[PDB]
UniProtKB/Swiss-Prot annotation:
Translocase in keyword set: no
Name of this protein: DNA-directed DNA polymerase
Record note on what altering residue 621 to A does: Drastic decrease in the efficiency of incorporation of dGMP
Catalysed reaction, written as an equation: DNA(n) + a 2'-deoxyribonucleoside 5'-triphosphate = DNA(n+1) + diphosphate
Region (Interaction with the polymerase clamp): 897-903
Binding site for Mg(2+) 2: 222, 327
Enzyme Commission number(s) from the entry: 2.7.7.7, 3.1.11.-
Originating organism: Escherichia phage RB69 (Bacteriophage RB69)
Job description of the protein: Replicates the viral genomic DNA. This polymerase possesses two enzymatic activities: DNA synthesis (polymerase) and an exonucleolytic activity that degrades single-stranded DNA in the 3'- to 5'-direction for proofreading purpose.
Length: 906
């Protein structure tokens, strides 16, 4: 019992919904929905309905949605406000599910799939779909099975069936190491020709139509490709059968380069995992290849193979198919730990939106706010359009490029959401303006107090302190829910430990697992019952506690993305509640908060250390400040510390008992200055960084805004056993930096921070020596092949032609005629190497497709003519020089008067 929806669409005058009924069965209904909208109505009938400003309204109820749209359009032409939920899907969901949705995830068909398409050049265009689909793995969550569709005959090669028994063997028995926990879950179907396979897959899709559809890049490649492929071979009518409502929209997306095609399948919610990860991971990443993220998430990765992916089928079909399966599995494993599908499902059902709408803060919040106001008989405002006007962003301090021995950092809790609550910023809490001074005047508390009666932002805006506001209200709701679910997750952690206690030597009874709520700390009587409990039952309880812990995590990450979504939405001109004044209010208040507390921290540390106008805050970014503790350490005396932990202890205690109290005083004052609704500027200690005691390491350094390294010992009270390097914007991770130089540069930084100049100097000479010995692939830089056609004049480079594009040209010249070498494609990644003067390739560099060897035809000639000197200079030394000059060290020992002497020592 308790129905929930699966997907909803509007097609003309009916709502097409897929849903789970009271019985638990998946059904489909078509509803000729009758929307309601609102007009302002001079209160001649004692009305229940008011807009967010308190103006009375009247309800108009329409025969069909099409009429409703006409009306809006009519109303707007006249100049009148068309109030209410103009997205009827949302209105429908709100009416039909006018309760808190409880959903059973096991009844939701979640498909995870990937395809393979062999093409002579290896990068086949989804819009054109010239090439046969020769492998599909489709995982179904309800069946818990991997359906594998294998093409045996292609124009590009014919192959034997894949072997499940070979797939299961270890690498050294010539196997693929497809895990046992899925080996038995594979249903393998080979096909003699593509038409067979596609027809079977399409029939398969009708029987098991995905509600939620996902995978890696399914939106930009896999879905468009199968759709076009089917359309091409069978016709559009057939391809449309991929939508349960037989409706389809093809959308063309022109990015910063060419274009791309996206297919909307009506009645299906596509949540591409790559986007799901980008949104919910809250971790910046140098690459978003499934291979890299698996590696990051699961400490392993995608299957490995000899040669280009475009040659894998012909050379190793066995691996080809296993690799495809594994790819689908990797996503499942990431989801196993990250839980982004369930998060999307929570959020979707929490807001009452199409599930794919979780990608859109403005859509989600539009819905959340609509439902909230609906329970109060309040009416939402018509959305009017606004110009895209650039307004202030975050404050980033320009740092003095230098080494910084001891650094301590602090950041504000959840800054923009905190500002919204503190100032009381909402479209309807606006109370007026004040004559505004330069921002620096407020930072310095020199400008006059804006208002004695209203809550103010340094941009000139005033807000009511007494009145509520939709934005601040809705946000504080989610804030509390976050605190609440966080609490559950923690209690489920502590309870899990209690159960892990009893598991070390439990009773040999025949009993059952206790029926308890894991979201709450166990009572003493429960703790006692647990001791005298069997291993069978305790293991069931530990599983239960951890399912609850996971639920807590997910629910509170949900609230986190929700909270930050709103903050971002208010800056988005497409948001029903957007207002430039309110967006500037938020960000300008931000900048003041950061520079004000910078001033206070400088004032405090000068007083406390007895120094004149000293710069303690060396850097800040958006919500965090970076404090040089060098003077604090001197004032004590460095030699007074017993070990590294001793000074880290000291800086912690100093942060806790001295700086934070001061910071809080500082922000309380700021709050009074702006006369805000409540004090919510909470800053506390983040990191403590420095060199190990009695080393010659430099601790950290900045080279510029967003470019710095720190040797971190402690993060928010947790002490690391090994110190952790925090590196930012230093090209240690850019795909462009060659793999070996990436490791090398990080080692240079590690030694700088931890060990000092001499260590760095010894490692530099060492790496320089080992350089000419490294695999050529590990030392090539990586670029993107963009606009090759543009700079291709006959066969030679053109005007102002990029270094890497020139390389691609010389490669294609050198492999021309011969049709047996891996070709370079537009919008693909390429390795690049410099060539020495007067080489047979007639240019100073060459480039080939990444993840491939150079073809044998020319490999050794290339390698022989490589310009290591230019290579090491451009990729390694230049970057390093940037670091060393900023830190004021030398990576090569400066000449000495002693150099010429043969000593026994150092
Ligand atoms: N309270 C409220 N109801 C709305 C609004 N927009 C559309 N409606 C619809 O009008 C009806 C109110 O009883 C419901 O069917 C709602 O789905 C709105 O802005 N506020």
């Amino acid at each position: 019992m308790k129905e929930f929806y699966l997907t909803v669409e509007q097609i003309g005058d009916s709502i097409f919904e897929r849903y789970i009924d009271s019985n638990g069965r998946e059904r489909t209904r078509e509803v000729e929905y009758k929307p309601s909208l609102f007009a302002h109505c001079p209160e001649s009938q004692a009305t229940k309905y008011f807009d967010i400003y308190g103006k009375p309204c009247t309800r108009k109820l329409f025969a069909n949605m099409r009429d409703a749209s006409q009306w809006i359009k009519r109303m707007e032409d006249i100049g009148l406000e068309a109030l209410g939920m103009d997205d009827f899907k949302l209105a429908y969901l709100s009416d039909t599910y006018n309760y808190e949705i409880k959903y059973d995830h096991t009844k939701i068909r979640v498909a995870n799939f990937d395809i393979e398409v062999t093409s002579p050049d290896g990068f086949p265009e989804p819009s054109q779909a010239k090439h046969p689909i020769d492998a599909i793995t489709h995982y179904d969550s309800i069946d818990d099975r991997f359906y594998v569709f294998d093409l045996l005959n292609s124009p590009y090669g014919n192959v034997e069936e894949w072997s499940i028994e070979i797939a299961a063997k270890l690498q050294e028995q010539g196997g693929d190491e497809v895990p046992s926990e899925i080996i038995d879950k594979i249903i393998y179907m080979p096909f003699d020709n593509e038409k067979e396979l596609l027809m079977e897959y399409l029939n398969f899709w009708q029987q098991k139509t995905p509600v939620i559809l996902t995978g890696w890049n399914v939106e930009s490649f896999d879905i468009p490709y199968v759709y076009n492929r089917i359309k091409n071979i069978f016709g559009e009518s057939t391809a449309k059968r991929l939508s349960p409502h037989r409706k389809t929209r093809v959308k063309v997306i022109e990015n910063m380069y060419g274009s791309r095609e996206i297919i909307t399948l009506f009645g299906i919610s596509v949540l591409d995992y790559i986007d799901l990860y980008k949104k919910f991971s809250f971790t910046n990443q140098p690459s978003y290849s499934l291979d890299y993220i698996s590696e990051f998430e699961l400490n392993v990765g995608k299957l490995k193979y000899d040669g280009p992916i475009s040659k894998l089928r012909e050379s190793n079909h066995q691996r080809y198919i296993s690799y495809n399966i594994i790819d689908v599995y990797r996503v499942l494993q990431i989801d196993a730990k990250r839980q982004f599908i369930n998060l999307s499902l929570d959020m979707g059902y929490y807001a009452k939106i199409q599930i794919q709408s979780v990608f859109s803060p403005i859509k989600t919040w539009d819905a959340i706010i609509f439902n909230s106001l609906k329970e109060q008989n309040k009416v939402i405002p018509q959305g009017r359009s606004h110009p895209v006007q650039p307004y202030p962003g975050a404050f980033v301090k320009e740092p003095i490029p230098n080494r910084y021995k001891y650094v301590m950092s602090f950041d504000l809790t959840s800054l923009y959401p905190s500002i919204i609550r503190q100032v009381n910023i909402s479209p309807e809490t606006i109370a007026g303006t004040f004559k505004v001074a330069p921002l620096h005047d407020y930072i310095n508390a020199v400008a006059e107090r804006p208002s004695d009666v209203y809550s103010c932002s340094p941009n000139g805006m005033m807000y009511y302190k007494d009145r509520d506001g939709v934005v601040p209200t809705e946000i504080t709701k989610v804030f509390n829910q976050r605190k609440e679910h966080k609490g559950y997750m923690l209690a489920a952690q502590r309870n899990g430990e209690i159960i892990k206690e009893a598991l070390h030597n439990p009773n040999l009874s025949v009993d059952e697992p206790l029926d308890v709520d894991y979201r709450f700390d166990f009572s003493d009587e429960i703790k006692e019952k647990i001791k005298k409990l069997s291993a069978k039952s305790l293991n069931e309880m530990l599983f239960r506690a951890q399912r609850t812990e996971v639920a807590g995590m997910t629910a509170q990450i949900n609230r986190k993305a929700l909270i930050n979504g709103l903050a971002g939405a208010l800056g988005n001109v497409w948001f029903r509640y957007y207002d430039l004044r309110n967006a500037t209010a938020i960000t300008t208040f931000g900048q003041m908060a950061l520079q004000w507390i910078e001033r206070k921290v400088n004032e405090y540390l000068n007083e406390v250390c007895g120094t004149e106008g000293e710069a303690f805050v060396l850097y800040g970014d958006t919500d965090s400040i970076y404090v040089s503790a060098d003077k604090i350490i001197d004032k004590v005396g460095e030699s007074k510390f017993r070990d590294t932990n001793h000074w880290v202890d000291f800086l912690d205690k100093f942060a806790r008992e001295r700086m934070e109290p001061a910071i809080d005083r500082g922000f309380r004052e700021m709050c009074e200055y702006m006369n805000n609704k409540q004090h919510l500027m909470f800053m506390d200690r983040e990191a403590i960084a420095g060199p190990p005691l009695g080393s010659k390491g430099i601790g950290g350094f900045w080279t510029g805004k967003k470019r710095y390294a720190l040797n971190v010992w402690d993060m928010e009270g947790t002490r690391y056993a090994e110190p952790k390097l925090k590196i930012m914007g230093l090209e240690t991770q850019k795909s462009s930096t060659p793999k070996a130089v990436q490791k090398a540069l990080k080692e240079c930084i590690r030694r700088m921070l931890q060990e000092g100049e001499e260590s760095l100097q010894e490692y530099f000479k060492e790496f320089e020596k080992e350089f000419r010995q490294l695999n050529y692939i590990s030392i090539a830089s990586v670029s993107s092949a963009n606009n090759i056609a543009k700079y291709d004049v006959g066969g030679f480079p053109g005007p102002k032609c990029p270094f890497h594009i020139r390389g691609i040209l010389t490669y294609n010249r050198a492999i021309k005629g011969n049709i047996d070498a891996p070709q370079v494609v537009e919008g693909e990644k390429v390795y690049v190497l410099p060539l020495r003067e007067g080489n047979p390739f007639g240019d100073k560099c060459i480039a080939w497709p990444s993840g491939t060897e150079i073809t044998d035809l020319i490999k050794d000639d290339v390698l022989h003519w490589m310009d290591y000197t230019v290579l090491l200079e451009k990729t390694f030394i230049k970057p390093l020089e940037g670091f060393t000059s900023a830190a004021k060290l030398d990576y090569e020992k400066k000449a000495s008067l002693f150099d010429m002497f043969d000593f026994h020592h150092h």
